[PDB]
């Protein structure tokens, strides 16, 4: 019975991400991934972050993308990483529908670079959110490179 | 001699001297001051320019007044463009080719005076619609002079006027467009666009201009952070800090010691070092930024004069020629631009 | 009161009291007199207080939509602040760095505090 109350209060937390001035969103984005990792198993937060990360009713996904990066990085144990990869498959089938195309390829590049391997892919992720829009051929190069680096991940 | 104690009677006498066709350029010169002042002389100058522009508005088939009035009084013409008679004069210059070309030439000779935002907005409202044979000259003036302003709305307005200008250039005849706009000047415009940063800031002008032309993983990450960090100046501040954060950190003093380095990233690097140290285990970002901050402070005080004398902002250049050294290496925009960056860095450090 | 809440750094309270001031002076102002001075100060500080805390479109009242539609009073101040709204929604640093040195004498002290807070939270 306490699980649905936890779902309700996590929904109120995401509601305070929905509205809210950017300092408040910085605070909720910083305190979020530790709370979501520590409180309950990650399937519910996975469903919630995919269902409330690609919403058109969202002011800006950048700190939410940092939330995505940290919640993927705290799920990098072995069977948990296979579950992560299955969630990447489900969420990329969700990504098959097109958003506004510049933000679409941007958020898809963030999702590729976040749930990824160890050595040098993660450190690019502040640079991917360094431009939110502004699609350029160099962004296509970075997106194709993280795509072919995820193709050898599977 | 009546001009100073009473302006309004001299403005009446200007209109009387206009209604009978007495146009001696010596008297209109000594009234309108052809190349702190008083107030009545300014009222007389503005009134004389207005009534003279209405005189050229009435009888315009005699066209020496247009050339003389546009060449000589050009800045003081556009400063008054929200009054009806000089507005009719402006709309009368918009129906001539040679007068509008001389007008854009006169703006080109005196563009450095049109640096205030109000006079520049009034030139943009005064170059709003001109004669169609003069479109190449106003496009060269738009891309050469009036696009490099720091004000963004004036850049936006001159962008919209330039895009409408190329749109009106394309709808006309191609033999009319090619005969006015040369190709080498077009390559000059395109290299001026691609030289500065206004090419990627404005997609529409470059797209329409190329349309008019065509009508006729380790070291790679090091290269990426060299692309992001080693620039002149940018808005990427926390982002550059997190980019230099995941450097292997056995080679930091190799990276920070560079001739072309964003020293403005040093204070966010120190803030990230503070967050990592107060969170848990120490960082190399903090000690790297500390070393290069103190080394650059020692360098920029090694460039200071040795025997220091006390500042006095009441009589600066009086005691010695030491102020030659405190204007030479001290008023230079490079070292002066480098100092408060290191002041932000030392503020975070202290 | 707005100067007090700006001292105690309740900026959203200053936004609420500034839109209440503009609502009152519009309702009683035909501007008539000193109501013009109120509208000038409130229009400069509400623009700077909208660029300081950039609201989401959910909490954005339609009055703020009207002012940011007007931006996306003396002439040099309107032109420089309109250029400053464009240079901030572009996020162009050197534009603002050269805009403040021209905008300093045209504003009072507390509005300069708000503009420095704008310049800090883009840098």
From Swiss-Prot, chain B:
Superkingdom assignment: Eukaryota
Expression sites by tissue: Expressed in the brain cortex (at protein level). Widely expressed with the highest level of expression in the brain (nerve fibers, varicosities, and nerve endings). In the brain, the regions where it can be mainly found are the cerebellar cortex, the neocortex, the striatum, and the hippocampal formation.
Membership in a protein family: Belongs to the huntingtin family.
Subunit structure, interactors included: Interacts with PFN1. Interacts through its N-terminus with PRPF40A. Interacts with PQBP1. Interacts with SETD2. Interacts with SH3GLB1. Interacts with SYVN. Interacts with TPR; the interaction is inhibited by forms of Huntingtin with expanded polyglutamine stretch. Interacts with ZDHHC13 (via ANK repeats). Interacts with ZDHHC17 (via ANK repeats). Interacts with F8A1/F8A2/F8A3. Found in a complex with F8A1/F8A2/F8A3, HTT and RAB5A; mediates the recruitment of HTT by RAB5A.
Reported disease: Huntington disease: A neurodegenerative disorder characterized by involuntary movements (chorea), general motor impairment, psychiatric disorders and dementia. Onset of the disease occurs usually in the third or fourth decade of life. Onset and clinical course depend on the degree of poly-Gln repeat expansion, longer expansions resulting in earlier onset and more severe clinical manifestations. Neuropathology of Huntington disease displays a distinctive pattern with loss of neurons, especially in the caudate and putamen. Lopes-Maciel-Rodan syndrome: An autosomal recessive neurodevelopmental disorder characterized by developmental regression in infancy, delayed psychomotor development, severe intellectual disability, and cerebral and cerebellar atrophy. Additional features include swallowing problems, dystonia, bradykinesia, and continuous manual stereotypies without chorea. Some patients manifest seizures.
Recorded domain comment: The N-terminal Gln-rich and Pro-rich domain has great conformational flexibility and is likely to exist in a fluctuating equilibrium of alpha-helical, random coil, and extended conformations.
Protein name per UniProt: Huntingtin
Gene: HTT
Curated annotation (Swiss-Prot), chain C:
Subcellular location: Cytoplasm; Nucleus; Early endosome; Nucleus, Nuclear body
Tissue: Produced abundantly in a wide variety of cell types.
Coiled coil, from the record: none
Assembly and binders: Interacts with HTT (via C-terminus). Interacts with RAB5A. Found in a complex with F8A1/F8A2/F8A3, HTT and RAB5A; mediates the recruitment of HTT by RAB5A onto early endosomes.
Function: RAB5A effector molecule that is involved in vesicular trafficking of early endosomes. Mediates the recruitment of HTT by RAB5A onto early endosomes. The HTT-F8A1/F8A2/F8A3-RAB5A complex stimulates early endosomal interaction with actin filaments and inhibits interaction with microtubules, leading to the reduction of endosome motility.
Associated disease: Up-regulated in brain tissue from patients affected by Huntington's disease (at protein level). In a Huntington's disease mouse model overexpression of F8A1/F8A2/F8A3 impairs proteasome activity leading to the accumulation of mutant HTT and causes defective mitochondrial functions.
Name under which the protein is recorded: 40-kDa huntingtin-associated protein
Species of origin: Homo sapiens (Human)
Upper lineage: Eukaryota, Metazoa, Chordata, Craniata, Vertebrata
Encoding gene per record: F8A1
Shown chain mapped onto the complete sequence: 187 to 364 of 371
């Amino acid at each position: 019975e306490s699980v649905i109350v936890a779902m309700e209060r996590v929904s109120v937390l995401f509601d305070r991400i929905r509205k809210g001035f950017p300092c408040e969103a910085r605070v909720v984005a910083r305190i979020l991934p530790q709370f979501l990792d520590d409180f309950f198993p990650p399937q519910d937060i996975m469903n919630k972050v995919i269902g409330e990360f690609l919403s058109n009713q969202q002011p800006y996904p950048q700190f939410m993308a940092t939330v995505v990066y940290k919640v993927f990085q705290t799920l990098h144990s072995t069977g948990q990483s296979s579950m992560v990869r299955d969630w990447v498959m489900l969420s990329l089938s969700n990504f098959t529908q097109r958003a506004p195309v510049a933000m679409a390829t941007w958020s898809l590049s963030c999702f590729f670079v976040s749930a990824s391997t160890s050595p040098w892919v993660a450190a690019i992720l502040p640079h991917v959110i360094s431009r939110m829009g502004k699609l350029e051929q160099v962004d296509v190069n970075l997106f194709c490179l993280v795509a072919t680096d995820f193709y050898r991940h599977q | 001699s009546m001009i100073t104690t009473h302006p309004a009677l001299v403005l009446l006498w200007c209109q009387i001297l206009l209604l009978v066709n007495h146009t001696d350029y010596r008297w209109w010169a000594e009234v309108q001051q052809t190349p702190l002042g008083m107030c009545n002389r300014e009222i007389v100058r503005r009134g004389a320019l207005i009534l003279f522009c209405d005189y050229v508005c009435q009888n315009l088939h005699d066209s020496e007044h247009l050339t003389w009035l546009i060449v000589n009084h050009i800045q003081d013409l556009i400063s008054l463009s929200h009054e009806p008679p000089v507005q009719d004069f402006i709309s009368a210059v918009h129906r001539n080719s040679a007068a509008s070309g001389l007008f854009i030439q006169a703006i080109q000779s005196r563009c450095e005076n049109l640096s205030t935002p109000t006079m520049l907005k009034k030139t943009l409202q005064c170059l709003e619609g001109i004669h169609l044979s003069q479109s190449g000259a106003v496009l060269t003036l738009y891309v050469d002079r009036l696009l490099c302003t720091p004000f963004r709305v004036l850049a936006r307005m001159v962008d919209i006027l330039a895009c409408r200008r190329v749109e009106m250039l394309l709808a006309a005849n191609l033999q009319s467009s090619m005969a006015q706009l040369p190709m080498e000047e077009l390559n000059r415009i395109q290299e001026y666009l691609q030289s500065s940063g206004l090419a990627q800031r404005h997609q529409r002008l470059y797209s329409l201009l190329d349309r008019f032309r065509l009508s006729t993983d380790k070291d790679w990450y090091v290269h990426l952070v060299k692309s992001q960090c080693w620039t002149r100046s940018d808005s990427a501040l926390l982002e550059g800090a997190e980019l230099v954060n995941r450097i292997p950190a056995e080679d930091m003093n190799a990276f920070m010691m560079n001739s072309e380095f964003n020293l403005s990233l040093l204070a966010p690097c120190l803030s990230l070092g503070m967050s990592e140290i107060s969170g848990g285990q120490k960082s190399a970002l903090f000690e790297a930024a500390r070393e290069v901050t103190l080394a650059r402070v020692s360098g920029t005080v090694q460039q200071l004069p040795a025997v220091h004398h006390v500042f006095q902002p009441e009589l600066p250049a009086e005691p010695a020629a030491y102020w030659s050294k405190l204007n030479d290496l001290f008023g230079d925009a490079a070292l002066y631009q480098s100092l408060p960056t290191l002041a932000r860095a030392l503020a975070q450090y202290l | 009161a707005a100067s007090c809440q700006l001292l105690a750094r309740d900026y959203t309270g200053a936004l609420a009291v500034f839109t209440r001031m503009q609502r009152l002076a519009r309702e009683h102002g035909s501007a008539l007199g000193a109501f013009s001075d109120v509208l000038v100060r409130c229009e400069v500080s509400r623009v700077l207080l909208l660029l300081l805390l950039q609201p989401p479109p959910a909490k954005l009242l339609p009055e703020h939509a009207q002012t940011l539609e007007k931006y996306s009073l003396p002439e040099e101040l309107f032109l420089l602040l309109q250029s400053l709204v464009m240079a901030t929604h572009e996020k162009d640093t050197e534009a603002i760095k050269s805009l403040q040195v021209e905008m300093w004498p045209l504003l009072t002290a507390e509005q300069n505090h708000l503009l420095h807070l704008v310049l800090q939270e883009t840098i």
